[PDB]
Amino acid sequence: ASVYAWNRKRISNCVADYSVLYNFAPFFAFKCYGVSPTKLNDLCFTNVYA
Amino acid sequence: GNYNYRYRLFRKSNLKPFERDISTEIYQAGNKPCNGVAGVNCYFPLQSYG
């Protein structure tokens, strides 16, 4: 979608595995604030929006 | 911005009491890190304060 009509989505009730992301692309941009990219697959969250 | 006070952001394991480390080796990623450059992870340990 275009930026002026961005698309929200909710993610809950799953066993989240963050080890699938690295295998997508060279990831020209990949950043998280106050969240360690490497320590993400072991912490647990309530609800994840996308 | 004063970019002279920096702090370690990435390490393999937590450190023992009263222990100091100064090495600025490039941090590990899913795969062998790049080389002091961006990539899938291949991060750099130190971060400034600002």
Swiss-Prot record, chain B:
Residues 2-10 are annotated as: Immunodominant HLA epitope recognized by the CD8+. Disulfide bonds join C34-C42. Residues 1-50 are annotated as: Receptor-binding motif. Changing Q47N: Reduced host ACE2-binding affinity in vitro. Residues 9-44 are annotated as: Disordered. Attaches the virion to the cell membrane by interacting with host receptor, initiating the infection. The major receptor is host ACE2. When S2/S2' has been cleaved, binding to the receptor triggers direct fusion at the cell membrane. When S2/S2' has not been cleaved, binding to the receptor results in internalization of the virus by endocytosis using host TFRC and GRM2 and leading to fusion of the virion membrane with the host endosomal membrane. Alternatively, may use NRP1/NRP2 and integrin as entry receptors. Binds to host ACE2. RBD also interacts with the N-linked glycan on 'Asn-90' of ACE2. Cleavage of S generates a polybasic C-terminal sequence on S1 that binds to host Neuropilin-1 (NRP1) and Neuropilin-2 (NRP2) receptors. Interacts with host integrin alpha-5/beta-1 (ITGA5:ITGB1) and with ACE2 in complex with integrin alpha-5/beta-1 (ITGA5:ITGB1). May interact via cytoplasmic c-terminus with M protein. May interact (via N-terminus) with host bilirubin and biliverdin, thereby preventing antibody binding to the SARS-CoV-2 spike NTD via an allosteric mechanism. This is Spike protein S1. It comes from Severe acute respiratory syndrome coronavirus 2 (2019-nCoV). The gene is S. The chain holds residues 447 to 496 of 1273 of the full protein.
